[PDB]
Amino acid sequence: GLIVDTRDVEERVHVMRKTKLAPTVAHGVFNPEFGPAALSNKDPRLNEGVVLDEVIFSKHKGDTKMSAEDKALFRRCAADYASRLHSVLGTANAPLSIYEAIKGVDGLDAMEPDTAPGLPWALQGKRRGALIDFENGTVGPEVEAALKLMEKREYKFACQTFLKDEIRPMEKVRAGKTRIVDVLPVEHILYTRMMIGRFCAQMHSNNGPQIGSAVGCNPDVDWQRFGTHFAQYRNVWDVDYSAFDANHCSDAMNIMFEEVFRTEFGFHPNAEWILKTLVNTEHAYENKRITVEGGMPSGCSATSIINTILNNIYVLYALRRHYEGVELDTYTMISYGDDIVVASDYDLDFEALKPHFKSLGQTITPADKSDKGFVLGHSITDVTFLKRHFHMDYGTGFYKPVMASKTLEAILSFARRGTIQEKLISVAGLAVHSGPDEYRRLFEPFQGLFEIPSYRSLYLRWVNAVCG
């Protein structure tokens, strides 16, 4: 987005200044070009002069203003995609009750009881369980008062900026390219789930190419479904965006909310409103208060779904900004936030599409970082999606999600204290698809030290999962 104002205040919001990823026994074996992101300005690994405070907000390079004709085109694309979405999902989009928004419904996980509560609560030393009854699905007076302000369209909030404690390529770490999480107030998440939670549940339950969304998928089971679909198209592309969430422009976010979340599709009128509160935001980082126009905060309850919807509309808009006769059947795609696979039997020129995405504020490049840029003839076995390749398994004849061994090494090389055993079981479920030899190599630093699931047990499990 466009930073329109920066100011200092006495109230100090203590941002992330720690590192909860300890190196494991595996670090010394694999020596990964990956490490924890820098969480303190006094981190020796960063380059001299690197000031994360500057770097971490450099993503806010502006808010692209769109022309009348381009906005009218975007509106048509948003309405055409919305028509497709709602035809699949239905229009039972009435608000969830407070209980259902807290506890979840089929296709929507319950709210987290002990994650960050956001502002102003973070100042007051209050936890989420002190504001909401996650067992009974009720709210206290504080939240109830805010919900009434939201009903009245009178609610205002600040985003709380957290630095993301995660493993990153050591190059990004050296450059201070630490990611931020914008933690919204828990009552804003709550009301958003009230306004659009049934829609989100339906999105999850209907994930697939038809709606262009993989949010809610299970890669172990669904890679077969997605792979067989994309295998039958002549051209497949995997596209990278630069700072996709920060570069969603005000015009595009407002129009998308207006066309997707209409009352004529069953939504309460405040569905559009609460989503629109995401466009112009205020972010709290220590004594800094930074006001931004445009861009999506990461901590909306529906950030992934909203990013996915925008991705779908961006592709239709860009193709239509360059070709005549483009329709939702001219191509197929599936997206997860900024992640995207597009396919088509037409020789679409993604190189030529670069300026049309730029008119939206977005910069697309091939995911292969090729020097020629986009090309034709790539297949589903060439692309990466959710960090996973699409590989045929020969015992079953089914597609399986295969992660890069370098990435698995990095994941296994760090862990927070007292979770190594738990993490190994988790990562084992990702690594089984790399085959027995690599699976063995990946886990050999932990032999005699922790329980390692047998390759056989996880393969037999996966087989029943993908067919049974």
Partner: peptide, 6 residues
């Protein structure tokens, strides 16, 4: 053939 240019 493929789609059209405007």
């Amino acid at each position: 053939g493929p789609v059209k240019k405007p």
